[PDB]
């Protein structure tokens, strides 16, 4: 008979219980030991709270000193939504190349939906500490208090760490830059354009160190979408109320083309909408001959059900190279981080009572 | 318990005791069609079988049924549920038996890998004294607020 104490499925490694200390995570010069961190987090290992807070606050301090609008030269690999899919982030760095020798730009939405959001934050923040001028992180619409308390990131923090760690993330997220000007050619944002943003200088003038407001240019940068019928407009209005999001706007193809021409840009690179292929190239601007808009989405098999590919964009040697990748296995969690007792006890009480009723007739 | 209840349980015991041996075997329980598809029948029988001889005698039958009385308190109900998981009856839910009992309930709705992963995480998160197993106290810390004891009531 199977042992009642030893584990049944021995091929599954038992996760480590030990929490890594500061000496184990930071080397002699105070640099993060990202190889140690990567291996531990892939095993669902945790850090000591003080060490998690040090990563979060040290990463925040770097972000805090960056501009609203980053100036990033090519080459760079541009990445879209991650949504807590840590084991797909590991594959993403395999496909895009090691941060030790690859410049990176992430367009936000690191957390929620996937159940490894805090591991994504801790690893990306450690990489930002280690590579402060070659790895870049923008804010997405989920990097805020409003969405992380509605979705699961806050609960995830309280299960694995503490609300103090959640609160530290929220203050760090307030430091995230909002946009990137890439190779003097591309405006890179999570969501898109705004009726109140006509020039790049309009981005530079924003106050970003705050929870995103319910309306306005900072909101729109994080939240806006192209029209459903982008490029095929009967819709003559440049900006219309975004009924899918419940806030911000849809932007039209003429709206994007006008912005690009006025600001001497080639294209807008953004994320924020899942794509079956991991990317979408939108209608070319009649004045550039280049797609006016590009969506990049880096979360494969989104929500474990979409069955989509992910992609990143490696821009190098005047080539825009789309690199797709499939999803990777990850450890299982019951919905809402429910434990097996809470999950099963209702059924136990139901079925034992049912038996007794039938036994007694 | 109540006299008229004892009389009714005697008559029901005899009807279930197909071979009139004075004890109820697993086959005899499984003769009831609605028990054949209940995945926790063998667990309940094992709990009733306090002397471990594989069958339920009348004393075991009465004491087992008594735990589902309206007068039983929360601890009594929750301790029966605890014993569903505690296959080896040592007073602690260990990893192997937690997996096995959950596997009985879920069948093919989860793969063995997925089930072992969430079993591991529940053991780690619910173990508070570090011995690697779940005591009744640790068990009640997790589920005590769910009020499942209110549902584990049977009218004899």
């Amino acid at each position: 008979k199977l042992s009642t104490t030893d584990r049944v499925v021995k091929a599954v490694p038992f996760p480590p219980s030990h929490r890594l200390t500061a000496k184990e995570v930071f080397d002699n010069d105070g640099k993060p030991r990202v190889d140690i961190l990567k291996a531990h987090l892939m095993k669902e290992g945790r850090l000591e709270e003080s060490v998690a807070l040090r990563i979060i606050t040290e990463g925040a301090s770097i972000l805090r000193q960056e501009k609203n609008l980053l100036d990033i030269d090519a080459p760079v690999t541009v990445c879209g939504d991650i949504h807590g899919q840590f084991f797909d982030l590991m594959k993403l760095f395999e496909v895009g190349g090691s941060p030790a020798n690859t410049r990176y730009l992430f367009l936000g939405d690191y957390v929620d939906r996937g159940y490894f959001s805090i591991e994504c934050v801790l690893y990306l923040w450690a990489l930002k500490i280690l590579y402060p001028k070659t790895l870049f992180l923008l804010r997405g619409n989920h990097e805020c208090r409003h969405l992380t308390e509605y979705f699961t990131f806050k609960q995830e923090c309280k299960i694995k760490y503490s609300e103090r760690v959640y609160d530290a993330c929220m203050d760090a997220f307030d430091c995230l830059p909002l946009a990137a000007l890439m190779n003097q050619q591309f405006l890179c944002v999570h969501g898109g354009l705004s009726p109140e943003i006509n020039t790049l200088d309009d981005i530079r003038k924003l106050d970003r160190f705050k929870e995103p407001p319910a309306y306005g240019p900072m909101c729109d940068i994080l939240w806006s979408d192209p029209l459903e019928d982008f490029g095929n407009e009967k819709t003559q209005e440049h900006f219309t109320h975004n009924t899918v999001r419940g806030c911000s706007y849809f932007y039209s193809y003429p709206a994007v083309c006008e912005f690009l021409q006025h600001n001497n840009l080639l294209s807008i690179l953004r994320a924020h909408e899942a794509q079956d292929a991991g990317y979408r190239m939108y209608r070319k601007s009649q004045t550039t001959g280049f797609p006016s808009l590009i969506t990049i989405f880096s979360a494969p098999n989104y929500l474990d059900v979409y069955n989509n590919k992910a992609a990143v964009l490696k821009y190098e040697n005047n080539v825009m190279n789309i690199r797709q990748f499939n999803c990777s296995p990850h450890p299982y969690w019951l919905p809402n981080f429910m434990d097996v007792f809470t999950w099963s006890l209702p059924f136990v009480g139901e079925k034992v009572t049912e038996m007794l009723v039938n036994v007694l007739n | 318990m109540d006299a008229d209840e004892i009389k009714r349980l005697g008559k029901r015991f005899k009807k279930l005791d197909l071979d009139n041996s004075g004890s109820l075997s697993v086959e005899e329980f499984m003769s009831l069609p609605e028990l054949q598809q209940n995945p926790l029948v063998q667990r309940v029988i094992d709990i009733f079988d306090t002397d471990g001889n594989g069958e339920v005698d009348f004393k075991e039958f009465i004491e087992g049924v008594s735990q589902f009385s309206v007068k039983g308190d929360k601890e009594q109900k929750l301790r029966f549920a605890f014993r569903i998981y505690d296959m080896d009856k040592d007073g602690y839910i260990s990893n192997g038996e937690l997996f096995q009992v959950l596997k009985m309930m879920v069948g093919n709705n989860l793969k063995d890998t997925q089930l072992q992963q969430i079993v591991d995480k529940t053991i780690i998160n619910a173990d508070k004294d570090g011995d690697g197993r779940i005591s009744f106290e640790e068990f009640c810390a997790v589920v005590g607020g769910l009020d499942i004891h209110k549902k584990m009531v049977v009218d004899v």
Binding site: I322, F325 | N108
Partner: peptide, 19 residues
């Protein structure tokens, strides 16, 4: 229910498909 269930000049564009 017989079993427990889980609750509810110009750059060229190139493609490297998934491995």
């Amino acid at each position: 229910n017989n079993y427990l269930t889980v609750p509810a000049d110009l750059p060229v564009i190139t493609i490297d498909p998934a491995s």
